[PDB]
Swiss-Prot record, chain B:
The TIR domain mediates NAD(+) hydrolase (NADase) activity. Self-association of TIR domains is required for NADase activity. It comes from Paracoccus denitrificans (strain Pd 1222). This is NAD(+) hydrolase PdTIR. NAD(+) binds at A11, W12, R41. It comes from the Bacteria.
Amino acid sequence: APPHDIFISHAWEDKADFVEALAHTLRAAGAEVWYDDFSLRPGDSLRRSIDKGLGSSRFGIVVLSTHFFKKEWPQKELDGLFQLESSGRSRILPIWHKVSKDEVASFSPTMADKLAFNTSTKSVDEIVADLMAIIR
Amino acid sequence: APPHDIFISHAWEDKADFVEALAHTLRAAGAEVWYDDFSLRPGDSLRRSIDKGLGSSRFGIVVLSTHFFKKEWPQKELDGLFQLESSGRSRILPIWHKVSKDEVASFSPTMADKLAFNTSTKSVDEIVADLMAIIRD
């Protein structure tokens, strides 16, 4: 089994005011979490990072915020992040964060049906409760 | 179902240089592209042009440049250029070309905040890879 339950992929701008908070709430709920090496800055490879993550984590969360999209990733990689596993199981769970639907439609990635979380419809506690349900 | 994958809305001044280069690159990558009857001139109806393009194409591209801005389109003419589909995605993909953000805001505030493709941040090839991804995925 992998040494990490979840890794949180995020743009560097979201580390201070959200990711750090989501991680702390998760760790207190019982999940083993790592994210320090998953802050994406301009220049980084998105796929390479995701691979290092699933490489030793059971699941992954990608913070889909405006800063994440502004990093201008390849639409192929982006559209890929959310393809479901041939096992039915979902390994990469997206969390939409402070974005406008109209504002990000040119890059909105093709994902599963009602597979994403949204901090606009749920608080960190609610989402962590759900994620824990998913980790067990 | 649609006989075309992509139509490219653009100001006539950009046909010669940019749009053509882009059209070639896109077709070379496997996209079915039309744009000859999509050059725009002051007065023309961006409105109807978009309807037409969307009536036979899967997606549309609009080149946002100074030339397209200097056409003075009324607000009611820009409105269709934003339409979104159930997927939350738009069938009209904008591409900023040699324009500043302040310049964009001057033309259309809403447009200046909509994330788009930018030839200032990606080569035409990179943009074409993204477009092919969008056509397929």
